[PDB]
């Protein structure tokens, strides 16, 4: 994430652009993910479980919209 400070751009919005620039490539996220060895049996387990919850939230959000709470 290379950021160049432009003319008439204060520090705060230049630093903030660096926040967004790093978050977009997520350089902090893979840094945590590589900090410890994760077995192939658990990365398949987390990937599978992550998909299940993402599907499970879709069905829950869909079925709620036909249900009234009051």
């Amino acid at each position: 994430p290379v950021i160049k400070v432009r003319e008439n751009e204060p520090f705060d919005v230049a630093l903030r652009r660096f926040k967004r620039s790093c978050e977009k490539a997520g350089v902090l996220a893979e840094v945590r993910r590589r900090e410890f060895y994760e077995k192939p049996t658990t990365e398949r387990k987390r990937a599978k479980a992550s998909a299940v919850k993402r599907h499970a939230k879709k069905l829950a959000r869909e079925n709620a919209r036909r249900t009234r709470l009051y």
Partner: protein, 66 residues
């Protein structure tokens, strides 16, 4: 969305087409997921292949920190 390769009737994405390829790599050179560019899975696999040919030939970079 709108996979642009199905609309233009392409058959091979042609790694030598760096002008097209650069629309599918991030500012850091990372390939952009097809959830974002709306590319069909079939062409995304050719696109990801073609980007790796270009990176070997130094037509595209691996990263922005070379």
């Amino acid at each position: 969305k709108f996979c642009r390769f199905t609309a233009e009737g392409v058959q091979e994405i042609d790694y030598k087409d760096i002008a097209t390829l650069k629309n599918y790599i991030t500012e850091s050179g990372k390939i952009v997921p097809s959830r974002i560019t709306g590319t069909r899975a079939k062409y995304q696999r050719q696109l990801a292949r073609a980007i790796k040919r270009a990176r070997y030939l130094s037509l595209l970079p691996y990263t922005d920190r070379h």
